[PDB]
Design a protein around this ligand. Structure first.
Ligand SMILES: CC(C)[C@@H](NC(=O)C(F)(F)F)C(=O)N[C@@H]1CN(C(=O)c2cncc3cccnc23)CC[C@H]1c1cc(F)cc(Cl)c1
Ligand SMILES: CC(C)[C@@H](NC(=O)C(F)(F)F)C(=O)N[C@@H]1CN(C(=O)c2cncc3cccnc23)CC[C@H]1c1cc(F)cc(Cl)c1
Lengths: 301, 301
């Protein structure tokens, strides 16, 4: 027992991280087969960062404008192109450590592991969630661009995130591996702000279940709510609406614990209205929303 | 910006995890060079559980009584010995993925990463701390024994923890890689309990410094404290004593923020007295004690 924020093992991804240099910009690249993926802003200098014309910055460049370095060794760049906000550099050598992989785009509410990297070297791994406002609450410093987020299913690495930027509130934005942003953001040095965030209701409920499973039960009551009454309360507290699909998804945990979802919803409604009355749930004095139902099942089995 | 519970990249350790079976017992082992380390209780049957004599059980075993599997490959065992509570199995193949490593024994308050494994297969990575009562608040199920805790410093893996057991309160106990337990615990199914846990004061202080570095000052106050007065108050909330050593260790963070250590102690005393009153620090509504000064420096700007 016990319940922790857990990331996937990161070895398969560490084997793919490289350093990409263009002029005096350095950041991280993902090396899969014979192509390296990195943010397109690598080709941008500070003079242009304010209002970059990527087409024009790229047209001016050749293979020899990029240097790719995997640990000790230079990879020779033999082609280059851009897909949305990602630069693709073709190299003369396939990565022998390439895992079975897919590129997937995730939905808000879904979680993934981030391997934070600097100068092409993996430095730490943590778990986070795609927020409803399409940011992530990461931990990222200068040089972290091109770090990736991933999930693992079987032996297959699903890459879902590449890091591009930080917003004024201190949260992070990036793209999928095909270079489409999550959220209404652009890759230029300009004032941009995240929309009001909301809480991921379904995840909170999942985590309440994990709490029950670990013997934290003080927040249960005899009562039950409806979906419609619950959503009225949710709306009030900037929680995402709970849909019938969410209810379905929690079916396993509901049957496992003997607490019906609309019962858990009544608990959660009470917690929103009254607070925790000085108590904690799973070592937390706030309602945690970065664990999915699947994560809860994964860890509790 | 941002601050996250961050683990070390697990790849170097993933390449060392194997499965060890003896009789009907299967658990995890750590394959370094031509040695597999695992908990000695792998040789205990369901009858031996209360008062096993491990020396007596081991002398009855042949090399061929132990099955070691790495992926699909059987490793032939060609020798065995016991050191304290760890079994060492000599195998005929040195692990080609052996990283640079050391074995270290850590002290209460120190943090490390855990690679949770089942059947020799890594399933997740998380960060935790050696509690003052010599337990860790892990997340482990049946079959997790042999999972290890580690730090990485400059490509060198410091292994500091091997998982052996769970206590009644749901927390976890184990040994260093020389097989000495942390704490008074024993590898027997006899009645054992964790002593009262206390908060790692030096770590809470470090984490307040992290909050300042990250741009939040709301909890500071105009006061200072003597070290003695600090301890007399903090111990009333079950916090560990802060020592002159701790104070020296916080000097770097003191210098970067310009807040004297004793001033930060005054801030903590007030937090303990007042609570958060609806506010958070670094995303948390309680005082986090599982980041060391070193962890904060590592992760922070
Ligand atoms: C409005 C945003 C575009 C901007 N935001 C801010 O500067 C602010 F205000 F939020 F800090 C931003 O993230 N600029 C990045 C910063 N950077 C990093 O390595 C970096 C990454 N993650 C967190 C950090 C924390 C501290 C310092 N650095 C980082 C280098 C590349 C640069 C960039 C990205 C891009 F997509 C397009 C262009 Cl042209 C330039
Ligand atoms: C007093 C403790 C010795 C005992 N715990 C209790 O009795 C308590 F307190 F949990 F009820 C305990 O941990 N037994 C372990 C359990 N185990 C696990 O795989 C295991 C590991 N981590 C978490 C789990 C969570 C759920 C189920 N299993 C696990 C198999 C091996 C066994 C063992 C270890 C040992 F060192 C000596 C002997 Cl002879 C037997």
């Amino acid at each position: 027992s016990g319940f922790r924020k857990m990331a996937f093992p990161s070895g398969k991804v560490e084997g793919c991280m490289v350093q990409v240099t263009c002029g005096t910009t350095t950041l991280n690249g993902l090396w899969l087969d014979d192509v390296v993926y990195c943010p397109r802003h690598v080709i941008c200098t500070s003079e242009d960062m304010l209002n970059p014309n990527y087409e024009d910055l790229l047209i001016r460049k050749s293979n020899h404008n990029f240097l790719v370095q995997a640990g000790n060794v230079q990879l020779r760049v033999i082609g280059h192109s851009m897909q949305n906000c990602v630069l693709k550099l073709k190299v003369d050598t396939a990565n022998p450590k390439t895992p079975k992989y897919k590129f997937v785009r995730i939905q808000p509410g879904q979680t993934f592991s981030v391997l934070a990297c600097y100068n092409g070297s993996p430095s730490g791994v943590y778990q986070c969630a795609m927020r409803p406002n399409f940011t992530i609450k990461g931990s990222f410093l200068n040089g972290s661009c091109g770090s990736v987020g991933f999930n693992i299913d079987y032996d297959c690495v699903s890459f879902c995130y590449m890091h591009h930027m930080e917003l004024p509130t201190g949260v992070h934005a990036g793209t999928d591996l095909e270079g489409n942003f999550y959220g209404p953001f652009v890759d230029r040095q300009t004032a941009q702000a995240a929309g009001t965030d909301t809480t991921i209701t379904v995840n909170v409920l999942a985590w309440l279940y994990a709490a029950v499973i670990n013997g934290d039960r003080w927040f249960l009551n005899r009562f039950t709510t409806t979906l419609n009454d619950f959503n009225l309360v949710a709306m009030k507290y900037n929680y995402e609406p709970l849909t019938q699909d969410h209810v379905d998804i929690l079916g396993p945990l509901s049957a496992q614990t003997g607490i019906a979802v609309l019962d858990m919803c009544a608990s959660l409604k009470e917690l929103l209205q009254n607070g925790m009355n000085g108590r904690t749930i799973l070592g937390s004095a706030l309602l945690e929303d970065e664990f999915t139902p699947f994560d809860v099942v994964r860890q509790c089995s």
